[PDB]
């Protein structure tokens, strides 16, 4: 089965309310862009990862939040939030529903 072609196709645009909502998954949000800013001539804030490798979180805090080390809630973009696949979504609910039946038995027995 054959690779399509490497020729480029003119870029098409649309964006409604609906298509913004879907795309929001696939773009680095605001807060996440500020990690790509590295402020020059001074060391990054880094927090070590579970693994212990340090994760630089660049400008994601304001220079007054560094010095007090507050960290910033800022604005949290709900749009990307991870959500279940279709297959997986019922297997949880179905498991849960079946489980409730089980508990009742022990409730009455």
């Amino acid at each position: 089965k054959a690779l399509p072609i490497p020729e480029d196709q003119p870029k098409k645009k649309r964006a409604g309310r609906k298509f913004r909502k879907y795309k929001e998954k696939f773009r680095l949000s605001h807060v996440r862009q500020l990690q790509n800013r590295m402020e020059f001539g001074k060391q990054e804030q880094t927090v070590l990862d579970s693994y212990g490798e340090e994760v630089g979180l660049g400008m994601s805090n304001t220079s007054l939040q560094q010095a007090v080390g507050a960290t910033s809630g800022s604005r949290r973009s709900a749009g990307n939030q991870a959500k279940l696949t279709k297959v997986m979504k019922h297997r949880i609910s179905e498991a849960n529903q079946q489980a409730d039946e089980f508990l009742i038995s022990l409730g009455h027995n």
Binding site: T62, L64, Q65, V68, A70, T71, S72, G73, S74, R75
Partner: protein
Amino acid sequence: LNSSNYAELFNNDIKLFVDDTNVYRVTVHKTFEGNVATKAINGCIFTLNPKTGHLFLKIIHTSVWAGQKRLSQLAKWKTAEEVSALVRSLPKEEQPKQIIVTRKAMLDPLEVHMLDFPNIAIRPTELRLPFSAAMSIDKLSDVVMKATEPQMVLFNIYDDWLDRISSYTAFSRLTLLLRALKTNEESAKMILLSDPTITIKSYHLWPSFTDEQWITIESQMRDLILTEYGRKYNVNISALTQTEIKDIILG
């Protein structure tokens, strides 16, 4: 905030506008020796949220500035303090998220008091917000000019427009009113008051109307801004695009 960012004000995010241009004011006089004299009067910070049309006015008393020099900077910090007070009075149900300020001079001094609420975000605007002209409102200015203490007074800027109309247009008209009270001031006031049969009640600010009274009034209020801007800057009104006008109206 931009002309392309304007819609994002009206999402379910709870908001505030804070604009300090009217905080410290000066009155020109002429001395008995005899040259120009300068007296300060009450400083009010106008903080309002578009969805519920609510004001919180802190009425800055003249004696607040009595014993201090460099009254330029002091006012900003006072305002910041007031703003910090304002949010801690609101429960986490009612606490905002985006606080917004026109003056860029206010970004730093807020953050110093806003650390305790890391959720809250602060923006500056490229949109000049005509809440400086809000002291052209009589009822406000009256309460302000008559105020003997630093205080707090709730109001509803939208009267009862909300009962009859969605808050977006309710706020968009409020621009045309205020943008037009920066401009030809009292000569614009007369656009409202042609009918004495149309009464301002004790409650409200803007007088009560029908819908089609506003529909015509808004056209008149719209005209001044187009005439004065062109006239000052020598540009014909007719040339401008739909887009172009909108930017003028916004600032």
